[PDB]
Amino acid sequence: SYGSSSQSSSYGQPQSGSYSQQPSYGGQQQSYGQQQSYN
Amino acid sequence: SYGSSSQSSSYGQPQSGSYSQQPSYGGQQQSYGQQQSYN
Amino acid sequence: SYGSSSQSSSYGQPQSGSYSQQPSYGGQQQSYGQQQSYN
Amino acid sequence: SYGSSSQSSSYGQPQSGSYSQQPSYGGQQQSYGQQQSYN
Amino acid sequence: SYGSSSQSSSYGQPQSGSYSQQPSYGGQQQSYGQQQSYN
Amino acid sequence: SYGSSSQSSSYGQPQSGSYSQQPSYGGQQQSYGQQQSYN
Amino acid sequence: SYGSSSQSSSYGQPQSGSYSQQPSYGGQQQSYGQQQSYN
Amino acid sequence: SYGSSSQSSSYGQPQSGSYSQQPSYGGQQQSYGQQQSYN
């Protein structure tokens, strides 16, 4: 009688190039873990 | 009768390039862990 | 009859490049851990 | 009959580059841990 | 020489039922509007 | 030589039901409006 | 040579029901408006 | 050669119900407006 969720993200040595435009923007993550009961 | 959620994020040696534009912006994360009951 | 949530974030040796623009801005994180009951 | 939340953040040797702009701005974190009951 | 994007969302009289579980969670939206040029 | 983005959201008379669980949680929105050039 | 972004949100007469649980939590919004150039 | 961002939020007659739990929590908003140049 339970719910569970998990998210994992990782980056390795990002932005190592030279003479260039390397802007970085994070994204969106949503994790839902729940148990619901009615009456 | 429970709910659980977990999120993990990691970065390794970011922004090591030279002579470049390397701006960094964080993103959005939402974690929901709950148990609900009605009556 | 409980809810739980956890978030973990880490950075390793960030901003080590030379002769460059390396601005850093934090992001947004929201963690919800709760138990609700009606009547 | 309880709710719990936890957030952990860490940084390792940040801002070690030379001859560069390395401004640092913190982000936003919100943790909610509560138990609610009606009637 | 331009890019444009727009998103619109609306809800009308939501959650009006009685004696029920009506939890509401928002979703994710991403809008990109930009112009890029190389050399 | 420009980029533009816009997002609009609206709610009308939300949470008007009786004898019920009507929790409300906001979602995530990301708008990007920018112009980039290289050399 | 410019970037622009805008976000608008509105709520009308929220939480008007009786004898119920009507908790309200705000969400996350991120707006980026910028112009970048390299060399 | 400029960047601009704007966010607007409004609420109308919130929390008008009777005999109920109507807790209110604000959310998170981030606005970025800037112009960057390298060399």
Numbering used by the authors:
A (entry chain 1), B (entry chain 2), C (entry chain 3), D (entry chain 4), E (entry chain 5), F (entry chain 6), ...: 2 to 40
Sentences reproduced from the published study:
FUS (FUsed in Sarcoma) is a 54 kDa RNA-binding protein with multiple functions, including roles in the regulation of transcription through interactions with the C-terminal domain of RNA polymerase II8,9, in RNA splicing through multimeric binding to long introns, in DNA damage repair, in cellular responses to stress, and in mRNA transport and subcellular localization of translation. The N-terminal half is an LC domain comprised primarily of Ser, Gly, Gln, Tyr, Thr, and Pro residues, and with no Leu, Ile, Val, or Phe residues. Although the LC domain of FUS is largely unstructured as a monomer in solution, the LC domain is essential for normal FUS functions, including shuttling between the nucleus and cytoplasm, DNA damage repair, and transcription regulation. Phase-separated high-concentration droplets of full-length FUS or its LC domain typically evolve over time to a hydrogel state, consisting of highly entangled, amyloid-like fibrils, or to precipitated fibril bundles.
Here we report studies of the C-terminal half of FUS-LC (FUS-LC-C, residues 111–214). Although this segment is dynamically disordered in fibrils formed by full-length FUS-LC, we find that FUS-LC-C by itself readily forms highly ordered fibrils, suitable for molecular structure determination by cryogenic electron microscopy (cryo-EM). Three-dimensional (3D) helical reconstruction followed by 3D refinement with pseudo-21 symmetry yielded a final density map with 2.62 Å average resolution, based on the standard Fourier shell correlation criterion. The molecular model shows that residues 113–122, 135–136, and 139–149 form the β-strands of in-register parallel β-sheets. Residues 123–134 adopt an irregular conformation that allows the protein chain to fold back on itself. Side chains of most Gln residues in residues 112–150 are buried within the FUS-LC-C fibril core, with the sole exception of Q124. Thus, burial of Gln side chains appears to be a factor that determines the core structure. The interface between subunits also includes contacts between aromatic side chains of Y136 and Y143, possibly creating favorable π-stacking interactions. The absence of charged amino acid side chains and the absence of purely hydrophobic residues other than Pro within the FUS-LC-C fibril core implies that hydrophobic interactions and salt bridges do not account for the formation of FUS-LC-C fibrils.
